[PDB]
A paper describes a structure:
As an adaptor protein, STING scaffolds the phosphorylation of downstream effectors, including TANK-binding kinase 1 (TBK-1) and interferon regulatory factor 3 (IRF3), which induce the secretion of type-I interferons and other proinflammatory cytokines to elicit immune responses against the infected or damaged cells. MSA2 is a small-molecule non-CDN STING agonist discovered by scientists at Merck. The non-covalent dimer then binds to and activates STING.
While other dimers were inactive, a thioether-containing covalent compound SCS2, formed from N1 and E4, induced the interferon pathway with an half maximal effective concentration (EC50) of 0.71 µM; by comparison, the MSA2 parent molecule had an EC50 of 15 μM (left). Because thioether linkages represent a previously unexplored chemical space of MSA2, we synthesized a series of sulfur-containing dimers D1–7 with systematically varied lengths to gain further insight into their structure–activity relationship (SAR). Further lengthening of the linker (D4 and D6) completely abolished their activities. Interestingly, their binding constants to purified STING ligand-binding domain (LBD) did not seem to correlate completely with their cellular EC50, a phenomenon reported previously. One-microsecond molecular dynamics (MD) simulations indicated that thio-containing linkers with four or fewer atoms benefit from more favourable interactions (for example, CH-π with Y167) and greater numbers of hydrogen bonds. Well-preserved interactions with residues such as R232, R238 and T263 were observed (right).
Residue numbers in the entry:
A (entry chain A), B (entry chain A): 154 to 317, 319 to 336
């Protein structure tokens, strides 16, 4: 029930507003003289969606192969008393064994971090057994809403991963893999 | 259950981050030469929380006595892949019968607009009977979390109103009333 809400409020309150735009984000950045012909930024927002853990804020400390590159242009909007709502995203370079596969506008779905916090907040009453179905149904609902919303289904790709045990998991390869897919 | 999540994710994902700061927002704006001694902006974020209707985006069209004044300084942060998350708020002037009672940093709680949208989204399965308990428990949970979070309890005031029938309701007086309260 909780994850359901957050997925709807993430789409309606954020994606539903910035997915129809943001094409010029990677248009101006890739054609900037200080990076002209140095990787063309991809046409979509790659959302990192962990499934077992709380979302980290810094990508460098999470995966060494992940490296902060730069920040793309900012935006504006009339949002609940904010006639100029600034939207900003940060570009990252996927460096797999020194070899940089590429760079794209990247960010984690923030509502996923909030539904993890809820489990260690005894007032919210969210339990760790439900947690699994929560983070999962947040990605599921975000995939399901993106299906019924074709104007949002494109312009964004979802990167979900489950790494509970050790299998040299790398959240950096998942991205490079998803970019080459289509 | 849904409203519960949104209130937690609004605090943890937005208020819990910008309430400890934002004091300098009204400090620099009130002392700007183009407004020096023309109303000192209040020290808190006044959140508009309707209880029966969907939040409007524009305040002018909602209440004539409400009038857009200006926008305050912007902010930055390390948020899920965004090393510079821009936070921006807009100041409004409460004009009651020509007489401007004052001006303060104002905005509607955006998660309230999303929980209304959910009622007319048959996929989300949210019903209009629950809607009442939803919008209500979103404000209730936001008041309850602000009680257990003293570092956030201050620096913000909640303005909840229920106007289903006609009683010349004015969402402009509610604000001026709340500012003089303390
Ligand atoms: C209304 O519902 C949401 C709006 C946004 S906007 C947003 C970002 O831009 C990503 C930056 C970040 O989150 O770090 C994420 C969400 C997620 C939700 S789901 C409800 S819980 C919540 C509410 C809230 C309000 C925020 C505002 O800045 C106010 C303006 C607005 O919402 O349009 S951020 C935010 C984050 C939330 O949970 C993650």
């Amino acid at each position: 029930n909780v994850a359901h809400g957050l997925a709807w409020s993430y789409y309606i309150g954020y994606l539903r507003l910035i997915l129809p735009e943001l094409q010029a984000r990677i248009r101006t950045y890739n054609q900037h003289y200080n990076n002209l012909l140095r990787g063309a930024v991809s046409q979509r927002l790659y959302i990192l969606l962990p499934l077992d853990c709380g979302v980290p804020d810094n990508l460098s400390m999470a995966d060494p192969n992940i490296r902060f590159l730069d920040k793309l242009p900012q935006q504006t909007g009339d949002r609940a008393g904010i006639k100029d709502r600034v939207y900003s995203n940060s570009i990252y370079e996927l460096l797999e064994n020194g070899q940089r596969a590429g760079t794209c506008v990247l960010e984690y779905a923030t509502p996923l971090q909030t539904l993890f916090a809820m489990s260690q907040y005894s007032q919210a009453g969210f339990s760790r057994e439900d947690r699994l179905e929560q983070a999962k149904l947040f990605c599921r609902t975000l995939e399901d809403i993106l299906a019924d919303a074709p104007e949002s289904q494109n312009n964004c790709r979802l990167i979900a991963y489950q790494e509970p045990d050790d299998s040299s998991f790398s959240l950096s390869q998942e991205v490079l893999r998803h970019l080459r897919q289509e």
